Amino acid sequence: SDLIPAPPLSKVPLQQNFQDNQFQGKWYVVGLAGNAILREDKDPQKMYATIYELKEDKSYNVTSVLFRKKKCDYWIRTFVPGSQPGEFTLGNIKSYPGLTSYLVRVVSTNYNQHAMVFFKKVSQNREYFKITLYGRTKELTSELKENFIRFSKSLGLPENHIVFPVPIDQCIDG
């Protein structure tokens, strides 16, 4: 493995006055960028969806659903409130083999249409980061997609590390 290095956290803005209640519900992954994300023209990445449910204790149950091998695949994360509102750590990190580190920062959102979220983790001592462009719908404007490309490039990622998953109906319409 050779990886583009994680950016310093100083280059990753935090959404001011983060509203945890308004960030809840279903988000479509309209854009994906990161040091382990590679464009694949033979088999282009399919859109998946992530559901944020705020618990009584103010941590998030995070359920993601993707269409793989004719079936809906579910995976669950717990996001624990971090240092400042809009940051999170991963609950029960010991239950993920090789994972020593996991950070979430909500970069920007208007809550009812779009969000950009930064993830950083250390797995088998390798440092991974990604940015997801979230949509409340499966389509976003040229403007929001160019904003996400610009932001991804500001963190050192070239074009072939930025993908726009293809909209689908299976699994993610529930």
Residue numbers in the entry: 5 to 178
From the paper:
Scn displays exceptional structural rigidity, manifested by its near-identical structure across multiple crystal structures, bound to a series of distinct ligands, tolerating multiple mutations.
P. aeruginosa produces two chemically-distinct siderophores, pyoverdine (PVD) and PCH, with relatively high or low affinities for iron, respectively. The quite large PVD structure would also not be expected to fit within the Scn calyx, nor would the structure of PCH-chelated iron be expected to fit within the key binding pocket, due to tight steric constraints around the iron center imposed by K125 and K134. A preliminary crystal structure of a Scn/PCH complex (3U03.pdb) was deposited in the Protein Databank (PDB,) by a structural genomics consortium. However, examination of this structure revealed a number of concerns. First, using the deposited diffraction data, it was readily apparent that the PCH ligand as modeled sat in negative electron density in difference Fourier syntheses. Second, this particular crystal form of Scn usually contains three molecules in the asymmetric unit, though only two had been modeled in the deposited structure. Calyx electron density features in the re-refined structure were inconsistent with bound Fe-PCH but were consistent with a bound sulfate ion comparable to those observed in apo-Scn structures crystallized from ammonium sulfate, and in the phenylurea complex. We concluded that Scn does not bind PCH, at least under these crystallization conditions, in concordance with prior results.
